[PDB]
Amino acid sequence: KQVSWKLVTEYAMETKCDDVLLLLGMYLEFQYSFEMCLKCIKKEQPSHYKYHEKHYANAAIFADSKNQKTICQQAVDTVLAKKRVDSLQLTREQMLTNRFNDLLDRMDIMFGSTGSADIEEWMAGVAWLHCLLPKMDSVVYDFLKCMVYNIPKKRYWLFKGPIDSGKTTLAAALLELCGGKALNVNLPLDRLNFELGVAIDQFLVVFEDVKGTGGESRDLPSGQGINNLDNLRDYLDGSVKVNLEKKHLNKRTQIFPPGIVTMNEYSVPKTLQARFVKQIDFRPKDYLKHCLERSEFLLEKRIIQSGIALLLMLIWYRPVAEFAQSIQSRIVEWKERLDKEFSLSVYQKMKFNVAMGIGVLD
Amino acid sequence: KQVSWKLVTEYAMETKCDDVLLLLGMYLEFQYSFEMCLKCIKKEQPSHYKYHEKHYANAAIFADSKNQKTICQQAVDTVLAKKRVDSLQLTREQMLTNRFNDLLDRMDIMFGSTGSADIEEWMAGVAWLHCLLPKMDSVVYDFLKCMVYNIPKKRYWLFKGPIDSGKTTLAAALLELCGGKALNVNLPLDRLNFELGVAIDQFLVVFEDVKGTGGESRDLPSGQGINNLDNLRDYLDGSVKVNLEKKHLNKRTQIFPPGIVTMNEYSVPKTLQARFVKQIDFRPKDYLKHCLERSEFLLEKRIIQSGIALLLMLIWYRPVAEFAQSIQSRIVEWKERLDKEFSLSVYQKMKFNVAMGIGVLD
Amino acid sequence: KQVSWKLVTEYAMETKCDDVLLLLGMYLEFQYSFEMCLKCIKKEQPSHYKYHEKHYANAAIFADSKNQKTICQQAVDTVLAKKRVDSLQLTREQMLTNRFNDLLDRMDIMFGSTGSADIEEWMAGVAWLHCLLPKMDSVVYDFLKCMVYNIPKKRYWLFKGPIDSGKTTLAAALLELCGGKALNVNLPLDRLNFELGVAIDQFLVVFEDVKGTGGESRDLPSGQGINNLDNLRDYLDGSVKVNLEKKHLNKRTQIFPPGIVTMNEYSVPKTLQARFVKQIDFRPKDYLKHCLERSEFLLEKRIIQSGIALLLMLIWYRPVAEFAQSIQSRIVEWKERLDKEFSLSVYQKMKFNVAMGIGVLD
Amino acid sequence: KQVSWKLVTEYAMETKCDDVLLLLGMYLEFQYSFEMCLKCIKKEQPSHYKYHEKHYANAAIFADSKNQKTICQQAVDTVLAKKRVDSLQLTREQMLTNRFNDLLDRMDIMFGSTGSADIEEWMAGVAWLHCLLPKMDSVVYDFLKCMVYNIPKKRYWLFKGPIDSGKTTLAAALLELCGGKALNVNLPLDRLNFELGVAIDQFLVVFEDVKGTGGESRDLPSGQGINNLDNLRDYLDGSVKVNLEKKHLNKRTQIFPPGIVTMNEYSVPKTLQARFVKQIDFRPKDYLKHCLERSEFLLEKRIIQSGIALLLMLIWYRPVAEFAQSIQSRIVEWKERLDKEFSLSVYQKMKFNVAMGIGVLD
Amino acid sequence: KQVSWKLVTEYAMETKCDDVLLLLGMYLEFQYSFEMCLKCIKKEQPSHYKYHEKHYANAAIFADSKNQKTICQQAVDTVLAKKRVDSLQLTREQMLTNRFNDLLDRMDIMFGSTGSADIEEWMAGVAWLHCLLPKMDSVVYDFLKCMVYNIPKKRYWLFKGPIDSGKTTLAAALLELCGGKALNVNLPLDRLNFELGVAIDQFLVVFEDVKGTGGESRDLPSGQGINNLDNLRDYLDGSVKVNLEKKHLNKRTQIFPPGIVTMNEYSVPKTLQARFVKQIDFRPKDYLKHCLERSEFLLEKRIIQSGIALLLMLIWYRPVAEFAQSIQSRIVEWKERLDKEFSLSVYQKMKFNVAMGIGVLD
DNA sequence: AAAAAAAAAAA
DNA sequence: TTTTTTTTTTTTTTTTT
Ligand SMILES: Nc1ncnc2c1ncn2[C@@H]1O[C@H](COP(=O)(O)OP(=O)(O)OP(=O)(O)O)[C@@H](O)[C@H]1O
Ligand SMILES: Nc1ncnc2c1ncn2[C@@H]1O[C@H](COP(=O)(O)OP(=O)(O)OP(=O)(O)O)[C@@H](O)[C@H]1O
Ligand SMILES: Nc1ncnc2c1ncn2[C@@H]1O[C@H](COP(=O)(O)OP(=O)(O)OP(=O)(O)O)[C@@H](O)[C@H]1O
Ligand SMILES: Nc1ncnc2c1ncn2[C@@H]1O[C@H](COP(=O)(O)OP(=O)(O)OP(=O)(O)O)[C@@H](O)[C@H]1O
Ligand SMILES: Nc1ncnc2c1ncn2[C@@H]1O[C@H](COP(=O)(O)OP(=O)(O)OP(=O)(O)O)[C@@H](O)[C@H]1O
């Protein structure tokens, strides 16, 4: 009896695999009998234990095939083909709505009865983050609104300030919240042409730690970042489709993503300054540090950088009407949950503790 | 039973798919029955809902085949094959006439009863654009003639002027009106060879914000853009064919397309300056800036940037005698439609508001 | 009869062959009759003599196949596919636990009846190393915890001291104990791109002798090393992901590995000094030097550089309960063996011989 | 009847063909009748005349076959696979023993019945070289043992002496005997990254003309090489692995090979001076020069630069028990030949003529 | 019935054809009936008219094949394989025997066809060169034999003279006779590696305008040429192999080729000068100058530079015994042409007119 | 190493 | 011929600047 190419394609679609070796590596695990399957007993990985029963009968045949890498290749290209259609035909609202469903699915695991997290530590993360900037949840909401409208020449924000001011702590959380990739523009220009190739089909990009010339009297290291970035004006604008490439691939033509620039206290050319909507100044304020010194778990679990900490902050602060009508049901249930197993008096004490510079928890 | 490779080729022709992953992604949607297809019920995308019921019977087989990507490759190469025949056998007037049918079809949907657009917003865009330059409709019509006649060494216009003067805004609209590609020449020569390969078989190219040198006396940073164009003079001239290249493909030999160069106010070597038929000086106009701030929908929906906002200008201002006979029927009908939905009083009111920096609607 | 592709895949999986020519080479040795196989009689290589008896009947057919390169490719693909899954799904504790029992397989061969390692010389290596630093087994064991937990900021160690003090001796041993690779960031910036590319998917990295720029008056040649680490703050801290590339490969994104920095007694900026959880100072010791002169086999057999010498140290000194539960039973057998082949008076006599430099075995 | 792919592979194995065109060419020579084969009559090439008898029957079928290039590719891959296994599993003793067999095979033909070489001139070469340094045969034998054991910090020998003193001559002969490469460390540190990449998988390296600072009292030209070696201590010491880089390839990790350093009478830093097991003082000897003036065939036939001259010296001077037990049979044979080709008195008369500075054959 | 691939392979070998499209085109011509074939009846090309009748019956089938480029690939590889079998075993005298046999195929163009310049002014070339140096033809033959034997230390000739001294014309002539390449050594040490890498796999080199020091003594310019070439002793003497570098490539090891050095009247250091076999002084000769002033065609038809004029000299002056056996027949077949077309007296008129200072006449 | 396309085995 | 299976090989990227 023949192997089904269809079932391998379906598994790749449900799992969203788009690496041929990962798909091959996963699907070969199903060749062993389900009854004895130690991974299905321990239930370590859902990408295994949800599917082994369904696929065992086909995987036992696949294990004897001579085609194994070409079977997986068709499956992976089917997943990429879907991902390419969705990139052209969804609105940016639907893209973000899908991302929030993915984060909510993670949260439903992380805080499930099998989950390793617990909410007070993540909610302390929300309490610390809401002290990093005034009206923080409005700043996040304005950012998402900006990244969705993608208005030409009005679609990049600048984060500027001293070192150890939380710029990339925040920018990394916004980047996980939306999905996207960080870029380094300080390269020699000959290689920069491949760095921008990372941006293809991303919803968002972050230009991190752009270095200028001058400012050495401020003890800033010099660098070419600002000078390189100033060549990319039509990439920032989004007024026209730019041409993007990867090693051994012919150029894609598409509008460059919106996003963020994070910078220390260099000077900036007017040709760039005209292309940022908003500049947010970050400045150091030691109680946030004293708090982190006295309650470290925020760093050790990477809670403070995580986009899920921002999603919890939005679920906490924002009205239900500000989300997509498709997703409101899940968000109301999460609002009910957070009002049930957490309390406003606790939150107020947490935010007070951060402002006092003591460690957050009791 | 077996897949009809012909039906897949036919669908790619009817929708002009020239990417394999896109064609594969689209054609796999037709697996499910049109009798309950939610995308058909919503009528969300015409390249789906017009075709699903026709192709369902074949796609149900295509989903089982072991060589799907090859079937799509022959289809995509057929589309590119026809596309190359047309580029050699049609006159430039006929090519433009096809493009105008494409825009008019998109308009007939976009302003149809199923369409989203309200024409009053777009005609406000026409009013704003007509304030951008003196005799704007004459400038656009003169540009079209220039791009059609393609006269040797008389093929490029220079858009020059300071920041936020509209150079990119108009260039992007004309680029959509004709169809074409933007090109970045600020990169170094070593990989510039693969950028120019994007111009193969295009009707226009646009060179965007070509960085000059010595502009620092006005705080404009220097770059290689002008130095690079001064090495491509035979490409601009169009007197003789040139050789154009894509990764892993052998060189095409053709005459390079005509187009636009956009610049901020650097100086230009006379060797290069001789290539330009015309220079247009753009300058910022305070009332135009004020106007958009009371009518931001023009930017959010990218109206003033679109080619359709120029096509509606031509339909409004120009005599029917200025269009190719094959479309004069449609253009008369569109003149008649606008003569029902508008009156000169409304359009004069819009212009008067723009000239005062008032909101365009009222 | 026809070749079993499955048996070739088993042999690749057991041997962990991921090189197609090596697998083709090994598997072709099996075609000769096992009864006369000199390579088996002499037990020269376990990758041969364990398996030849099993696979002979299949290799005799494989030797006549016309497809041999494909059969070895699919086998090698299967091994690489398993490495992908393990890399993405094991915990760092499981990674190190596998790496330990992999070293125990080497020890079981080395000290077996068929092996060639004199355990007394290796145990003298343990004695010499335990005299290199105070509380050496704690220094090693605390390092392992640090590399497993990978807590941001608290995840790099500094080794500093004069030339000829044991720094790379210990760092090379830790590299074998844990896996990982050495790096040399004394280059100029323009090739750091491919140098840092070595770190992809490594459990550790070691920065080998990063030179300072100042202090050369102590006969300390100036170099770029520490100035480059100042520019790698984010790679060290490990709070956020970074992009890495290899020649001819597209970039991959991951958190940079934890590790060690080693240097001569240069000065260091405090902006970098804050990034080390601990610093170890190494100093020359005449008794160790005179011991090495009188116990040369330690060098000539590369004992003190090896990770197995540190694993023997951990087996000797640490309590069983703090190894991972999977491996504890195998470690108990090794403790019992070492308590059979040695006693505390003998081991103390070796330490005492080192402490006076007389040479270990007397 | 059908082509035996195995028999084609067997010919490639016995001939050590790495080249698929050379193998295709060589194997097609066998298609013509053996009875009349001019090459089998004159017996010029053993790779033909040993094998044409055997393969003729198969080569006839091969000449009609359509797959000819494919059959050769599998054969060549089998030879490459065998070479990679050996490279990972042989001991240095066996690797050297293979080279001696290759040199003896080459000797057996060049001094065979068709022998173009004259053994009297080659033994005059032995007599000349044995006068260049005292106890030369022990110098060669000790060097071989040193390069075979590859013991840490006991791996490099230093050749010092003026222009025209013999350093490059003996180094070239030892490179031919043992195999290896020559490196030029006098380059700027920029290029050394690709110099050292030549050492990958080599049995030896020789550093040529490693020039230093100072020496102007000897009118020596200054250079960087000595300072560069003083930095590369790990490559010399050989205690731990290093990373080696070729062009385009990614870095490989191995123990750097043992070798030789050659220089004029520069001053050597006391740090670098510790890296060498032994120093050899080469000195000009006018009587050897006057012998060469009267013995030009030694230079014109490149005898004294050859490795085979050293192998002849070892065969003459050393006892059979110093050779590897595999090859001792051929050594006995060659002694039993050489002891009747020459008397002791004839060899002493050569060595006497050299010492007199007379023509060696007089 | 079916296409014989072997017949296509025979035709490829008998025509020695080694381009797949050239072979495809020529073999397709045979598909037409030879009874009518105008290319045969006109006897245009032997590669057609010799073979058409034989291959017609096979080409009629080949014309219907779907594999035609496949069939021709195998035929071409058979020729390339045979070419490589020979090249690996070629003696250095046969290498030059080939070069002249090929130059005779080119000279057969002026044999019996009008497709060439008139030979009477080429013999005026022969006569003028034979007045430049004493016994000029011996100098060519002695040099030629010197380059064939490749005897170490006896490999380089030095041409010294001012401007307007003919030395460069003779060097260019010798270069074009032999097939080497010319190298520049006046560069800084930075650049010499890639210059020397030009010499890989090559018969000669020539060194041009190697500048000295102190040239202001005679208003000669200065550059590092002589200072550099003095260091290249191992490249010149040819006693041992050297490794040579092309850009973007790994090194190759070979014995650097013999050649010519051309130099102005600078001071040459004895340490360099001793490496030449022979110095030839070139000196200006006013009668030769007045001849070539009066016989412009010597220069303007390239005659005195073109190396084929040196063969044309050797062809006449030298015995038939001095040439290699496989071209002796071809020269004596050539020799009689000049013995029919010219006489000793008219050649002496050419010589006499050159010596008189007048153009060649009668 | 991936992409373009050829080249061969089994029905 | 038709379908399934195996193979060829380079270009690009890197190197050079
Ligand atoms: N406002 C603040 N005041 C004091 N300490 C801060 C503040 N924000 C962040 N920190 C501390 O700074 C550390 C580093 O933060 P982060 O990496 O976000 O800084 P950054 O200035 O954006 O850095 P970079 O430009 O190098 O990415 C945090 O882990 C936290 O301990
Ligand atoms: N002539 C104008 N006067 C005032 N505002 C303008 C004008 N043209 C455009 N704008 C505003 O400036 C924005 C940017 O315009 P645009 O990018 O086309 O200018 P540009 O002159 O091409 O600029 P740059 O040199 O920075 O690329 C527009 O979206 C619009 O909001
Ligand atoms: N504490 C010590 N005192 C004296 N000799 C030592 C000591 N530790 C090691 N040695 C010897 O000195 C050699 C040099 O030390 P090691 O190999 O670790 O290099 P290092 O000079 O300390 O490191 P690096 O080259 O990275 O600066 C060792 O290989 C060993 O032979
Ligand atoms: N001991 C010697 N005495 C005199 N002449 C010698 C001696 N050894 C070699 N020669 C001559 O010197 C020539 C150069 O010698 P060799 O190739 O060994 O280079 P070298 O002396 O090491 O010098 P360099 O540093 O220039 O490479 C030899 O070809 C030989 O003719
Ligand atoms: N013996 C001669 N006397 C006078 N003129 C000569 C003589 N030989 C050649 N000529 C003419 O002088 C020209 C210059 O000489 P040639 O081309 O050989 O260069 P060269 O003397 O080597 O000079 P340079 O070093 O400047 O290249 C020749 O091309 C030829 O026209």
Side-chain angles (χ1 to χ4, degrees), chain B residues 231-261:
Chain B
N231 296 337
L232 299 174
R233 296 188 298 226
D234 53 332
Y235 296 69
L236 302 183
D237 295 340
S239 282
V240 66
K241 296 189 179 186
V242 299
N243 310 304
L244 302 178
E245 181 173 8
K246 282 174 176 282
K247 294 190 194 178
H248 308 100
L249 287 172
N250 283 299
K251 299 207 176 201
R252 267 281 280 163
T253 300
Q254 65 162 100
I255 302 183
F256 192 76
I260 294 162
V261 174

Side-chain angles (χ1 to χ4, degrees), chain A residues 19 21-22 24-26 28-29 31-32 39 44-45 47 60 63-69 163-165 168 172 181-184 187-188 191 194-195 198 208-209 211 221 246-249 296 299-300 302 305, chain C residues 2-3 5-6 13 73-74 77-78 80-82 84-86 88-90 94 149-155 189-190 193-194 231 233-235 237-241 243 245-251 253 255 275:
Chain A
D19 170 11
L21 289 179
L22 177 59
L24 178 60
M26 285 303 305
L28 285 174
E29 301 193 319
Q31 77 190 278
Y32 307 120
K39 282 170 173 164
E44 300 193 332
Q45 294 291 347
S47 310
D64 297 345
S65 182
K66 301 178 180 69
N67 309 85
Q68 289 177 344
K69 206 173 188 174
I163 190 166
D164 294 339
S165 307
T168 58
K181 292 189 177 183
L183 305 174
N184 176 12
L187 292 179
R191 295 211 67 73
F194 286 120
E195 183 74 359
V198 174
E208 286 197 316
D209 193 23
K211 299 176 185 168
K246 282 180 176 180
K247 293 183 190 176
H248 314 95
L249 284 167
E296 298 181 71
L299 293 165
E300 307 201 329
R302 295 180 170 82
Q305 306 87 3
Chain C
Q2 188 171 21
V3 186
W5 290 49
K6 207 168 194 167
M13 287 271 262
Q73 275 284 19
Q74 176 162 301
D77 285 318
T78 303
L80 290 170
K82 188 169 182 179
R84 273 280 167 78
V85 171
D86 287 355
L88 294 176
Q89 297 187 1
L90 295 182
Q94 288 161 335
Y149 298 160
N150 190 20
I151 290 156
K153 297 193 174 190
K154 300 203 299 280
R155 72 178 203 138
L189 298 175
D190 63 15
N193 72 307
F194 294 125
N231 284 275
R233 152 181 165 91
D234 46 347
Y235 294 78
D237 285 6
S239 301
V240 297
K241 294 184 177 180
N243 302 323
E245 75 165 328
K246 283 181 177 179
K247 298 182 191 182
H248 301 167
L249 280 167
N250 288 301
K251 307 210 176 188
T253 305
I255 302 182
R275 306 194 188 304

Side-chain angles (χ1 to χ4, degrees), chain D residues 132 162-169 209 283-285 292, chain E residues 233:
Chain D
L132 181 63
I163 304 301
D164 302 348
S165 60
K167 318 178 298 308
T168 297
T169 301
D209 296 351
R283 294 294 175 246
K285 287 166 183 178
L292 289 174
Chain E
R233 65 166 297 178

Side-chain angles (χ1 to χ4, degrees), chain A residues 153 275, chain B residues 132 162 164-169 264 283-285 292:
Chain A
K153 215 170 198 180
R275 292 173 152 75
Chain B
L132 187 66
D164 298 342
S165 304
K167 309 179 298 283
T168 310
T169 302
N264 284 273
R283 282 176 286 270
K285 289 164 177 179
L292 296 174

